C-alpha cells in the first residue's frame, strides 16, 4: 500500500508510551534499530517470502506463517491472534502487542535476522538520540 512512515522520534515516543522500553529487557533504541532496518518505520510495509508463501508485515515486519493470520500463508499458526492487516494500521497498538508476543518466545529479539545483522552488539544510541525519551 502507499507508505505511512513514522518519523524516528515520534515512533520512539509512541513505542515508549506503549511500554516497549525495556520490555523483555529490550531497550527502545533496539526496537528503533529493528523497525528501521525492518520497515524503515513504514507501518504499511509488507514483504512476500516466496520460499513459503509467507509475508512480513508493518513496522516490525512480523511473519504471517507464525504470528499473524493473513489468510494466504499455507500451514500458518496465528500466535498473536491478530490479522496481519491489523499490523498495517497507523495505530501501532495491535502491532506492538504482537512484537511483544514475538520476543516472549525463547529467542527474543534475535528472531529477526536483520536485528541480528544490524543492531545486535552495536551501538544503537543514535536511534533514540534527540527524541526526548
Ligand atoms: Na516533524
Ligand atoms: Na514534519
Ligand atoms: Na507524539
Swiss-Prot record:
Recorded name of the encoding gene: LYZ
Keyword annotations: Amyloid, Amyloidosis, Antimicrobial, Bacteriolytic enzyme, Disease variant, Disulfide bond, Glycosidase, Hydrolase, Secreted, Signal
PROSITE patterns: GLYCOSYL_HYDROL_F22_1, GLYCOSYL_HYDROL_F22_2
Keyword Secreted: yes
Species, as recorded: Homo sapiens (Human)
Catalytic activity, reaction form: Hydrolysis of (1->4)-beta-linkages between N-acetylmuramic acid and N-acetyl-D-glucosamine residues in a peptidoglycan and between N-acetyl-D-glucosamine residues in chitodextrins
Additional notes on this entry: Lysozyme C is capable of both hydrolysis and transglycosylation; it also shows a slight esterase activity. It acts rapidly on both peptide-substituted and unsubstituted peptidoglycan, and slowly on chitin oligosaccharides.
Family that this chain belongs to: Belongs to the glycosyl hydrolase 22 family.
UniProt protein name: Lysozyme C
Sequence intervals crossing the membrane: none
Assembly, per entry: Monomer.
Claim: RNA-binding is one of the keywords in the record: no
Superkingdom of source: Eukaryota
Any one Gene Ontology molecular-function term assigned to this protein's record: lysozyme activity
Localization (cell): Secreted
Disulfide bonds, paired cysteine numbers: 9-131, 33-119, 68-84, 80-98
